[PDB]
Amino acid sequence: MDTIAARALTVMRACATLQEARIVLEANVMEILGIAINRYNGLTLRGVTMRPTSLAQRNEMFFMCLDMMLSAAGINVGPISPDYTQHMATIGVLATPEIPFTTEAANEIARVTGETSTWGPARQPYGFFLETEETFQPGRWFMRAAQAAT
Amino acid sequence: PNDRDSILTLLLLSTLADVYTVLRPEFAMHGVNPMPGPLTAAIARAAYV
Amino acid sequence: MDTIAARALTVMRACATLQEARIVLEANVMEILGIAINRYNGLTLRGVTMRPTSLAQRNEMFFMCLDMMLSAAGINVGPISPDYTQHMATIGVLATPEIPFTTEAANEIARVTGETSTWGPARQPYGFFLETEETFQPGRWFMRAAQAATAVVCGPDMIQVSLNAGARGDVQQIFQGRNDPMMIYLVWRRIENFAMAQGNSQQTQAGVTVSVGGVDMRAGRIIAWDGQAALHVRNPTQQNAMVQIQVVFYISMDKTLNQYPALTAEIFNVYSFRDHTWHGLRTAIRNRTTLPNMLPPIFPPNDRDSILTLLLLSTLADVYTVLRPEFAMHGVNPMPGPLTAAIARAAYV
Amino acid sequence: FTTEAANEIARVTGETSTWGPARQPYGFFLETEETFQPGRWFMRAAQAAT
Amino acid sequence: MDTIAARALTVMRACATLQEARIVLEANVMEILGIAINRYNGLTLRGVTM
Amino acid sequence: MDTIAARALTVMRACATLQEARIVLEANVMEILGIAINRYNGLTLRGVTM
Amino acid sequence: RPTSLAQRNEMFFMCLDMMLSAAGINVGPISPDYTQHMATIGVLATPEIP
Amino acid sequence: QRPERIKTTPYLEGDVLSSDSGPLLSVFALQEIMQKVRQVQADYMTATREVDFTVPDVQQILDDIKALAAEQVYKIVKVPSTSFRHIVTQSRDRVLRVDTYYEEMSQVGDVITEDEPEKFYSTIIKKVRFIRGKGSFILHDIPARDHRGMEVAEPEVLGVEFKNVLPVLTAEHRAMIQNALDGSIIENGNVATRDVDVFIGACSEPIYRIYNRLQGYIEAVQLQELRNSIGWLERLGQRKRITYSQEVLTDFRRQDMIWVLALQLPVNPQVVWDVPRSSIANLIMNIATCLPTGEYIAPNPRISSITLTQRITTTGPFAILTGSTPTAQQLNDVRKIYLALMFPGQIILDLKIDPGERMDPAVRMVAGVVGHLLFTAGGRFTNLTQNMARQLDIALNDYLLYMYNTRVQVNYGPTGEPLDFQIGRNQYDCNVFRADFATGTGYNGWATIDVEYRDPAPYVHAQRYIRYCGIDSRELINPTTYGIGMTYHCYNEMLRMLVAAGKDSEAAYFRSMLPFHMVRFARINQIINEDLHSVFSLPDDMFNALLPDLIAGAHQNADPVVLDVSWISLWFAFNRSFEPTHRNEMLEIAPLIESVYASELSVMKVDMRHLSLMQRRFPDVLIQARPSHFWKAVLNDSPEAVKAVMNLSHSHNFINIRDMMRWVLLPSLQPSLKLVLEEEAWAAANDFEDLMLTDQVYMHRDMLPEPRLDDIERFRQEGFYYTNMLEAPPEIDRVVQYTYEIARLQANMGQFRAALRRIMDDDDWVRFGGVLRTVRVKFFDARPPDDILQGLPFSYDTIKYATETTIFYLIYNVEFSNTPDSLVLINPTYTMTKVFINKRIVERVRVGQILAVLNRRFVAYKGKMRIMDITQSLKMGTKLAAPTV
Amino acid sequence: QANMGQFRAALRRIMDDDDWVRFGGVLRTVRVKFFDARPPDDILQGLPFS
Lengths: 150, 49, 349, 50, 50, 50, 50, 885, 50
Prior knowledge:
This is part of a larger assembly, with seven copies of chain A and two copies of chain H.
Chain A: H1 2-15, H2 27-44, H3 56-73, H4 90-94, H5 103-116
Helix pairs in contact in A: 1-2, 1-3, 1-5
Chain H: E1 16-20, H1 22-41, H2 58-66, E2 84-88, E3 95-99, H3 100-106, H4 117-135, E4 144-147, E5 150-153, E6 160-161, H5 171-181, E7 196-198, H6 205-220, H7 223-239, E8 257-259, H8 269-274, H9 279-290, E9 293-297, H10 327-341, E10 347-350, H11 362-374, H12 386-400, H13 474-477, H14 491-500, H15 504-531, H16 540-552, E11 561-564, H17 567-574, E12 579-582, H18 590-617, H19 628-637, H20 640-646, H21 657-665, H22 673-685, E13 697-703, E14 735-738, H23 740-748, H24 752-761, E15 765-768, E16 775-780, H25 786-789, E17 795-796, E18 799-800, E19 805-810, E20 830-835, E21 842-845, E22 859-861, E23 866-868
Parallel strand pairs in H: 2-6, 8-23, 10-11, 14-15, 16-19
Antiparallel strand pairs in H: 1-9, 2-3, 3-21, 4-5, 7-22, 9-12, 13-15, 13-20, 17-18
Helix pairs in contact in H: 1-9, 2-20, 4-6, 4-19, 4-22, 6-22, 10-17, 11-12, 11-17, 14-15, 18-19, 18-22
Subcellular location (chain G): Virion
Organism (chain G): Bluetongue virus 1 (isolate South Africa)
Function (chain G): The VP7 protein is one of the five proteins (with VP1, VP3, VP4, and VP6) which form the inner capsid of the virus.
């Protein structure tokens, strides 16, 4: 399940490297991106390009990331656009062990699931007595009846 | 937040956000009306209900 | 996503077919299980037979159903047993389009998702004025100071108006307030014999009329009241009168136990004891959910996940029944004695 | 250029080119000229709530 | 010494990639753990598996 | 313009890899420094080494 | 095997056509997109259909 | 044995006509396409570069590729290459080590010149390749000697030549070294079991790099990788309905066997389809590999005429159907047809007219009808040419209008366009059987779905799966809806028309023929989307693109092949059905061949990639460039088989500079052992000094170091070697930088010498940047040749840059008969050229320091073990016991 | 089981447990023979599998 997220994540961060690629450096990424896009385009029947240029192509790729992102989050947004439609099938694309994920994505998730599943000591943000209904003037004496220390 | 799904979702969105930036996607969305004029802190303030 | 649940359902329902050997498998079933079990074993690396018999063979199969059921519900039970361990990968088997599902399962899910995602009109379960802090004696006269007509509550679905001779007035406001009723069904009667402020009997004369939105309505007949129209009561008689208006029933867009076919029985099945192993299991599973770990929720859930989870758990219950799996759980101590209603009672906290 | 560098810049260009809500650094009434003793009664003339 | 730490880090970070059994790894990972595990198991004499 | 910054960034981050003397450069890195230094030294005429 | 939408609608229209023929209903002109084919009954009367 | 081939009723059991196979058709296809061109070009006024449209041997090319799986890149040795050598000076306390690597590298490719850029390119490739080869080590069984309870490595497995030195060693030095030798132990040593030996031996850096990356691969790529890839085939096996063995793959790995897999199975669709102008070649490959062997069946003679009495028999309206096949001249012409529809819109059909052979016009009628119900001009994909269709409509029209019996009411339409009329006593449009490509209203699947995307495909280019007339092969296995009615819409409407208009007599023929027809089509479908979807299959993208692009006349890279038929052939094609016999043997190994092709392909792309950058890296070296140059030199040093697959279509004589550039820039690659090695070795290549060619070449008038000899025994010094290789470059401010252009101009003007001299006189430096130059290293015992001392970095016959640049090492040797000043000369001896590399090629060392080289790691597989490459075990019919996902 | 080199072992244990095993669910033809004395090992120890 986390693996699915890592995958989707990897994909997006990778799509965010085509501002102009002209021979990518990260061979790792490519291998994965190709794989993913093929698998996607196969089950989707859409036409995502490795190197988008038009706009429709860019939208297409975006929609893909969106689809994956949503599937990874376990979200069904429903009809929110006349242009975009969410393909539930997307989950079946990320479930394939055929798709690798970056070490980055792996660790990113490992951290989240890691701490999110357990507890730990942490400096709290606000004052201790913040959720108090009554407060007194500072420096002003006050001794509650019958008490020697108040 | 304190649950996986919360944190995760944010991360995915944060990333998808950047993807949005770089790709410059253009499309419609039910209930949204685009104002193409350059964009200012003013126009933005308004968008937050 | 629904497909995933449909699969996991089909698989379980299929395993239930495996009663006690003397069976000739429905050709169709064989095919399905085989594909599933195959793929499952290829991801679990566990040894699931298509036709179990030993026990350890049965456990393995149950465990499979369990793994799938949980994955379909999106639950992570964690370390609850030494004998069983949940494989999260179970989801990937269920996401693979290579495993089919029955028409039965498909519709079963489609119904849950279908209704759960939208709203609808449904006869509510309890009396209209149930969530009320104050109630008055039924049949007893009561006129608030300075009023000619005084409507008041006397029960869960009961109100009675005290009219002075010749007095009239609107009443609808006593009903309004409780968020959203779509159509209240009424029936009003004359309190022919009621108690006075002092205790003496008093008669209500024939002639008192009740009109909704203007049109005059008979007594003892059901009325399609839209909750907005003017509920006007008149007393042309020269005597004191007291009429009771009864909310026979009303409909709202709140989810009832009739959102999904015989949901009730399913829930019963889920919450039923069976044995300590089942009990403790089912408990531990719901601890991950918004559902009460061992006592029927007062208010019928309204989210896909809840309804779904119940159905899955309900079926997985039957699987437990046919398979007779035997394993341990942290904190569970099986009492071997024949099992009586007594032993069961005690188990529920 | 690396994906690391790509994302790095993409983020900068992204957020920098637009605005967004954020927990401000200092106390609200920091840029105030006058302050009154805490817990001390003070009623401005002609007012019942000051 | 910085190098030593950077390595140890890189390796662990890569081991963190093993969330499942069958899954395919990014070539980078394979290369790293491949060499690492070799020389490690070499001087370690223990039996680590990719 | 983002690309430009990202490039310059990548280069620096890459030069940062030169800790020890004998360490074998990350394959990926050399592809960078190689192209860079060649182009740079081309314009500069200076003699920078990998 | 539907995929588009018009393919999905087309199928739904079929289910509608049948659903109606079965209930012995004739809704008439209720949509510019849909047109009920009375012929649908002739289909459901075919013994070949299970 | 025969799954669906089971013939239940005699109705399907007809005679045998001919038979075809994969290699049969694949050749035929090419042939036909080549005749096409010669026959036109040779026929009309033609103007273009001459090309020899030859039909190559498909089998032998294929068989050669299957032969590649064998060729392994790794080389198993028992001892590593030398790496280091020691050269002795007169001195007895100091020596000089040399990194062998650099020497070998020195003399790899040809000398570099700004004239031949092609020469340059290959020169580089050879050099890179060299590195990759020098690095594919394995080290199996090492000379482990016993010494003091420890097992140590024999000096042979280390990386040094020191035997030279030994004899001049001081008892002390000797001893030191001996300890260093029996110093390097086998780490684990006393353990037995082991499996591997770890020692310390020396090694040249670049080489080491490869050794390591390799070592990693062989240990990373094991069972699982293999498991996956096989499972893929196991999956494709089901799609192709493969008959399976009783065996299973135990993932049992013997403790002796270390596996070496070189290619993974799930092949990247794109690498194949990225190749420019591939379309044809790919297609043919698709045929030659996947297209099974089968025979054409004739219908039952009883379908037409039937005997009632010895004297009374019925006669089919087409008595002409007794024509003996118009030679292969047209029989082949039928094969075209079948093959055409068996490859969707990939091959289109067109008339062809020999003004000779006079046929009876009736042929046109029949063919007009036939064509309409056997070809798909459906708005989904299309089989025929635009004009092809018209001719069939005119054939149809002309013949609906030919009434050999009583005439029916023909109510013509306002348009003169054929098929406007409405013949029939009940009217009926014939306008329906017109010819709209966006609708397909006339011909096949006019009201049908023939492109059914469904199920995830084992391939992924194409997920589609074709249903001609909406008949799934399943209807054969188990029927769908009776035998009476099989009729698909079109064939049905065809009947109705034939009736209303002309006559039933013929419509009866087609009525009874119908089943035979659909059966033939059901089989065809099966064959298409089942029996032959390979990598060469063709992506749905391009498929869908075909139809509309054809209408607009775009520029479809995958231009469909237009084949020309014969009116007659339609009848014949209609009366033959083709029933597959055996699946071509190539099939089960197909995927493997594919992997080989794809992976070898990508490797080239990689090489070419980096080479394109070369021009921009050093624009001065290769002024006269052009991409064709490197891609030519790459194609040169890469395997024939692959190249031939690309040139099946003869594309190589068409691929424009731009076309190839795009392919280099394309980014779809297929990983392979070869690939990773090439890329890694390739990476280290980026240094250039590691290639032995530098920009760092200077000139500076320098004296030859003539020392004073006061203590001859003190020349145990570094034997005072000289060398023009600089310890470090001069201060950048004191250097006059020179460009190709600058030098060029000054020289053409005849000012270069002067300027150069001035600089020399001023004791300044001058660097010659922009160009690379091959660098060589020579050593001397005494006063080397003037052409070396006073050698310059350019020719003066116009100033010609580059040249070889010799880095010498002059060793000073002296006898006891040498007077202190004897070495001095009244006039100095000058040396101009100097070089700088920032790589420790030749280094002055002590003696006890000799062995310091060790350094490097090293892991060697113990003699006990057997290294085997499990690369050819990627056959399809292999199932595993552990199912996998 | 055989893929893990556990097949033989498994069978042995089951037999040692007195428990019975039954392969398949296929019909199998039945043969009937009579003996006067100790039958062939093929009949006694003939295993219903290979």
